[PDB]
Amino acid sequence: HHWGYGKHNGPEHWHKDFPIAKGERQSPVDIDTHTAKYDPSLKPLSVSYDQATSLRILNNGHSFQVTFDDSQDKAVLKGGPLDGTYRLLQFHFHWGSLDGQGSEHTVDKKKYAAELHLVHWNTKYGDVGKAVQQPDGLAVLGIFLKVGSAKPGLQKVVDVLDSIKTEGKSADFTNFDPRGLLPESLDYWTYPGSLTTPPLAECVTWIVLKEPISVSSEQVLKFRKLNFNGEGEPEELMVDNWRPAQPLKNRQIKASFK
Ligand SMILES: O=C1NS(=O)(=O)c2cc(-n3cc(CO[C@@H]4O[C@H](CO)[C@@H](O)[C@H](O)[C@H]4O)nn3)ccc21
Numbered sequence: 001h002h003w004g005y006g007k008h009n010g011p012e013h014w015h016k017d018f019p020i021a022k023g024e025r026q027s028p029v030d031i032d033t034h035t036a037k038y039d040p041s042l043k044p045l046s047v048s049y050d051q052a053t054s055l056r057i058l059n060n061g062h063s064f065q066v067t068f069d070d071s072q073d074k075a076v077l078k079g080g081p082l083d084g085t086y087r088l089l090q091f092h093f094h095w096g097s098l099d100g101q102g103s104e105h106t107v108d109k110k111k112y113a114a115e116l117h118l119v120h121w122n123t124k125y126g127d128v129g130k131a132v133q134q135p136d137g138l139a140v141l142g143i144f145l146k147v148g149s150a151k152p153g154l155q156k157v158v159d160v161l162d163s164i165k166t167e168g169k170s171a172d173f174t175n176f177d178p179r180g181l182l183p184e185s186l187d188y189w190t191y192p193g194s195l196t197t198p199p200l201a202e203c204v205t206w207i208v209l210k211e212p213i214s215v216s217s218e219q220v221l222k223f224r225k226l227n228f229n230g231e232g233e234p235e236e237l238m239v240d241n242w243r244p245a246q247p248l249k250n251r252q253i254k255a256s257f258k
């Protein structure tokens, strides 16, 4: 009885194995745009992805992820609300069964069709395992996806999904440039939160971009043909792998823009 997103092992059950699920800085949250506070002391984000080295793409049974070489300062995030340098480790997506759901964060209760998470870890802690134990260990860049025109920089990902259909499958995925996934603007909201999957550690500075990227209906359709199950088991489509919004409690959401 592992955790997942079904009726019997979904987000409402996770607290039994991970009691921090009911903690004080859980993610995702609804971003109320009229109560977020513009903070002029926030710096522009600095995204330096020019030397990124992607390694593999993997279906982990919960989402699919692209992993990067994080052994040096190749692809780093700095600035914004962050102190220090955060290395890119992986990206993955959360998506829905229908176009009106799929994101984890919401904006004035609006849900997007998917959400992209670029996960980075604070190099002062030496390895990612140490970083997850610290309140400033991780920085996740979140990007909303809406259905519209195709995103050409996503197509290399879509085209390899057939080869990682079921849980446990991986493939070589080199020379992918994550800059092709970013919107035009880097305006953002930020707040202190958590991982959105077990173990739900409260170690994340969230940086959620205001501007969504557009992807085509055919691109999102390919996400929805992945499988939660391993090869040989009964087919269960990988859809609706998102955690609902959690209480904000004693936290302020700050905006880099007004
Ligand atoms: O679905 C999710 N959305 S999210 O909140 O952006 C997120 C983050 C993670 N993170 C996982 C990790 C650590 O991953 C591995 O963990 C071990 C120790 O955990 C290392 O020893 C290993 O080498 C490291 O590669 N850091 N973030 C996983 C899933 C989601």
Ligand SMILES: [Zn+2]
Residues within 6 Å of the ligand: 092, 093, 094, 117, 196
């Ligand atoms: Zn995620």
